[PDB]
Design a protein around this ligand. Sequence first.
Ligand SMILES: *[C@@H]1O[C@H](CO[C@@H]2O[C@@H](C)[C@@H](O)[C@@H](O)[C@@H]2O)[C@@H](O[C@@H]2O[C@H](CO)[C@@H](O[C@@H]3O[C@H](CO[C@H]4O[C@H](CO)[C@@H](O)[C@H](O)[C@@H]4O[C@@H]4O[C@H](CO)[C@@H](O)[C@H](O)[C@H]4NC(C)=O)[C@@H](O)[C@H](O[C@H]4O[C@H](CO)[C@@H](O)[C@H](O)[C@@H]4O[C@@H]4O[C@H](CO)[C@@H](O)[C@H](O)[C@H]4NC(C)=O)[C@@H]3O)[C@H](O)[C@H]2NC(C)=O)[C@H](O)[C@H]1NC(C)=O
Ligand SMILES: *[C@@H]1O[C@H](CO[C@@H]2O[C@@H](C)[C@@H](O)[C@@H](O)[C@@H]2O)[C@@H](O[C@@H]2O[C@H](CO)[C@@H](O[C@@H]3O[C@H](CO[C@H]4O[C@H](CO)[C@@H](O)[C@H](O)[C@@H]4O)[C@@H](O)[C@H](O[C@H]4O[C@H](CO)[C@@H](O)[C@H](O)[C@@H]4O)[C@@H]3O)[C@H](O)[C@H]2NC(C)=O)[C@H](O)[C@H]1NC(C)=O
Ligand SMILES: [Cl-]
Ligand SMILES: [Cl-]
Ligand SMILES: [Cl-]
Ligand SMILES: [Cl-]
Lengths: 522, 518
Amino acid sequence: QDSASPIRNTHTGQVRGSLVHVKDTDIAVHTFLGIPFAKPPVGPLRFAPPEAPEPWSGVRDGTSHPNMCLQNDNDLKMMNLILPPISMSEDCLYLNIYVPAHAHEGSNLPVMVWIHGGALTVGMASMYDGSMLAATEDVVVVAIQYRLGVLGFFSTGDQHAKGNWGYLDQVAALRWVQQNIVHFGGNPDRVTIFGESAGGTSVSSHVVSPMSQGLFHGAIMESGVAVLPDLISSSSEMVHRIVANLSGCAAVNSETLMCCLRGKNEAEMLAINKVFKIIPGVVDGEFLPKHPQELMASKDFHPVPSIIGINNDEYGWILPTIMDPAQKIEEITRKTLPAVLKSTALKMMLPPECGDLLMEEYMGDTEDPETLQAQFREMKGDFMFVIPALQVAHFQRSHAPVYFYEFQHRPSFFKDFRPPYVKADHGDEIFLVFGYQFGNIKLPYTEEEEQLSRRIMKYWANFARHGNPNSEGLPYWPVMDHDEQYLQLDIQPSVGRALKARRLQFWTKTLPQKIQELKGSQ
Amino acid sequence: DSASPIRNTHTGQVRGSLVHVKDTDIAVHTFLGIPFAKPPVGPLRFAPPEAPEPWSGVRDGTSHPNMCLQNDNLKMMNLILPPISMSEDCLYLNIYVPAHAHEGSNLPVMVWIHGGALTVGMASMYDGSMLAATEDVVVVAIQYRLGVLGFFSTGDQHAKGNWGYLDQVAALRWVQQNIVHFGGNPDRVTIFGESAGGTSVSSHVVSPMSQGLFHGAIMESGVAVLPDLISSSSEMVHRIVANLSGCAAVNSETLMCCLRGKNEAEMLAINKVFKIIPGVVDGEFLPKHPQELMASKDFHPVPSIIGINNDEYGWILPTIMDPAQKIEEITRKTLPAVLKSTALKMMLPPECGDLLMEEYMGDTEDPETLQAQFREMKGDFMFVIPALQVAHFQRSHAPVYFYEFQHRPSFFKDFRPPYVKADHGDEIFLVFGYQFGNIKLPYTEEEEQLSRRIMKYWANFARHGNPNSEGLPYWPVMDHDEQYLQLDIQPSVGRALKARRLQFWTKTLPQKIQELKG
Ligand SMILES: *[C@@H]1O[C@H](CO[C@@H]2O[C@@H](C)[C@@H](O)[C@@H](O)[C@@H]2O)[C@@H](O[C@@H]2O[C@H](CO)[C@@H](O[C@@H]3O[C@H](CO[C@H]4O[C@H](CO)[C@@H](O)[C@H](O)[C@@H]4O[C@@H]4O[C@H](CO)[C@@H](O)[C@H](O)[C@H]4NC(C)=O)[C@@H](O)[C@H](O[C@H]4O[C@H](CO)[C@@H](O)[C@H](O)[C@@H]4O[C@@H]4O[C@H](CO)[C@@H](O)[C@H](O)[C@H]4NC(C)=O)[C@@H]3O)[C@H](O)[C@H]2NC(C)=O)[C@H](O)[C@H]1NC(C)=O
Ligand SMILES: *[C@@H]1O[C@H](CO[C@@H]2O[C@@H](C)[C@@H](O)[C@@H](O)[C@@H]2O)[C@@H](O[C@@H]2O[C@H](CO)[C@@H](O[C@@H]3O[C@H](CO[C@H]4O[C@H](CO)[C@@H](O)[C@H](O)[C@@H]4O)[C@@H](O)[C@H](O[C@H]4O[C@H](CO)[C@@H](O)[C@H](O)[C@@H]4O)[C@@H]3O)[C@H](O)[C@H]2NC(C)=O)[C@H](O)[C@H]1NC(C)=O
Ligand SMILES: [Cl-]
Ligand SMILES: [Cl-]
Ligand SMILES: [Cl-]
Ligand SMILES: [Cl-]
């Protein structure tokens, strides 16, 4: 049967993979783990663009998971059970490849490149196992890594540190895929980039980037786009000043600062890094030559065909758990709501006068605390995820096919160990995209969930093959046009039109107009 | 007006010098002999290029670099060269920048790739000062491994090949990393080159290894399918070098150790056998044959200028490849046998001789006319038909601007036979504003105006991916109407250049070859 130790060519040398079986298939998978796509970004290559990797002499071991990039532990008890024993290092520019075991140089399979999320400060490729997706849909799955936190996103806003190191690493990984994936049996002309949350923001940033042109044929943006408010910044000023200050560096010049910051060891860099729970991309002038808003609004914007979507409860549970650890949302009453919404307006970078606009839009005359709290979670999910997705879909759909989804399936394994109000939380679709297969865990699923995961994997792989999710036997997914149709993605399939049109009117026209009226009372 | 400018690179500081260009106000900073790769010597012979080493202090950028190892077989050519030596240590580039420019000036960048059949040439023949000064542009002249050292391949892991092409990639990666320090815009890099430099540029256009390293391409009298400069098989270069070296190894691992042991004189002796050497389909720089890469529905070329001259086989190439002047012996009596010999060189069966004769000579009796028809046919096969085929493949995916250059240079007109129109290379004089290594060529007022037009077309293309600007004659983009610029003192536009010849070479002759079979 299939080879236990497959050897494959790369530009830098041969790599030895291993053979893996997935549940309930004769189809086996070849894995190639920890392949370097760039030189380790250490010493003078810290806060520098990625350089081309060194050649090696022998057959390189491709059976070991790579180091994750430097990051902090900011429950997560379960993440360390369902993770390999991964170590952490500045030496982390590696990718992992999952290929059907039949495939070899020239098999010409579609390629799906997974970009992990984690607020551009946490995560790793080795959390994700592409074996089930690879095996079921006859597809090459590539999981990449990129610099995170200060090492990924530090910027002086000048030539000494333009920034977006992590995004340049993602470019370097996609260039590697163009140059090498044919040797693994992938088709470099059918590469689809996909990612969730900050991975969606990453994918969406590639879609607008002149630097990423020709590195992929299609894009999938799950619960994250390039204008996700906390992951993009016009100014480098605060990351510049905070890192310069905390590092203790003498900082008369950016040139002196860069020498001092390159002198810091890993423990010193981890201490500076821990301050940033989230970190934004900047307008670096290279990867993002302008703000993603300006790039999408451009008459000369030429996006690839795209899938864009969101879940029906983006702010249901996991994000409130992380960003409201004291459970203040459960204290919301009609009495407290005005003050909570003034505090929310400031976090959304609105004037505090907008608190009452948010209240009228999302809560109206509602007195019931349970209802008020659900309206509050709706409003947050809309601001952070749903409105940005709808805006980006609107900008892309005049130039290229957009297929829009709202994912609605509450996962069976979580529904009893979460509050009963939680529908499809942030990240709930990832379980179905990967066929319930992750690092060292097969998640439990119902028959219905298996059928829905098969449907989602075939939509995604069909899109990777053809730039269209549709095929005979899958429910119809209409392309998004002036009717603004979207897939209601659940066990029972349906189609809607103009998702949250009144909310989109509120956020994009009503609220900016009312802010402009405040400047008139002043 | 700085006499000794200092500029930053990733590997350290360089000291340039100040140059003034004839009768004009813009001065130029030059930075010569900058390393873009580690010397490809010892274990780095027949190996991909490594990143250059950092240096302490300020490196001298006032001296021209060594040329790569090569053989000479034009006495007065070396009179117009600076006194440069030859070495395996030759991975250097030269930079010409307007003297006003500094780190962040964000000028367009033009990267010149020299020709010479992938066996001869050097950056130091070319002086970018006049182009840099006239058009406010950074001009970079690169070097790359030539001959056996550039293009030896075992067709396997031990020597995949295309070392010279990987050096050109390494020079473009250096430009991405460093040109901002010289005042160049790394997002407006245009690669340009003539003949094997055109073939090189055209190979970058199809290469996944070169994607994102340039914004535009200019292919002067050479593309990636130029018949003698591409090979599917490494077999002949593999066996000839293995045999001549005396290495005689049963395995390519032993062969590679033996070939790395040879000194420079031993390598020059092996090298001399190859007057021309091809790129291989290595699976990496060229993942498939350039024909297949261009024919692909997923071919994504940059905007391109592609062109040829009206007399590609007029004088210089016949002088080099017909030293015995047997073209001047052609008569109606000898023509059939000459064309059977020509068919074999074009890799056609000898039966095709009479097809070539009908197509290019017909009933013609006059020896002078027959000889002109023969030179036309060779220029068409080697240059014109390949350029039109590549322009056809590119133009449905990206803007192509096509030119036929027609200007006979005034300084050569009296010296050459009167039948010679715009010979192979004649446009290079106008692209560089008649400025070369330690020579300013003499030109008429009309030639100055035409050179200013060509430099502005090329620099406009570097800035915008479109040669056009107000005051230049219109250059239409190439679409289904197949318009091209007739580039001469009097501007004009044609459609479907040599359409009957294109029909002959691309449909009639292949059909008749398939009729010889079966
Ligand atoms: C990281 O950031 C923090 C915070 O920075 C601040 O906030 C951010 C957001 C930005 O807005 C910054 O612009 C802003 O500065 C930095 O911490 C701050 O550091 C500054 C110095 O830049 C301090 O200002 C001085 O404070 C001293 C008094 O404070 C000292 O004593 C404290 C104990 O009570 C101790 O905890 C402090 O650490 C501090 O100790 C000193 O530290 C500095 C820096 O290393 C060192 O140079 C001193 O030698 C040392 N001093 C002593 C006695 O131990 C105050 O006395 C100073 O006043 C003089 O200096 C001013 C500017 O130079 C000037 O305007 C004043 O008028 C005054 O000037 C003197 O005048 C007389 C004549 O009248 C003359 O004879 C003297 O020669 C002359 N001297 C000078 C030098 O001019 C001064 O105000 C801030 O208090 C401090 N803030 C906090 C909250 O801690 C930190 O530096 C950053 N780190 C890095 C690596 O960048
Ligand atoms: C470089 O290439 C040279 C040509 O090689 C041939 O052509 C290439 C393209 C391939 O097809 C290759 O496979 C061919 O062999 C090559 O020169 C040649 O070398 C071979 C030996 O491999 C010679 O064959 C033998 O010749 C002798 C006669 O003596 C002469 O050769 C020796 C060599 O040491 C000299 O010292 C003498 O003075 C003579 O000049 C025959 O007696 C002998 O026959 C016996 O051996 C073979 C098997 O080994 C049996 O098949 C026979 O039955 C006999 O038992 C060989 O036939 C060949 O004649 C010679 N050609 C020429 C034109 O000189 C050269 O060696 C290559 N260089 C390196 C370093 O590899
Ligand atoms: Cl490396
Ligand atoms: Cl995230
Ligand atoms: Cl070096
Ligand atoms: Cl040439």
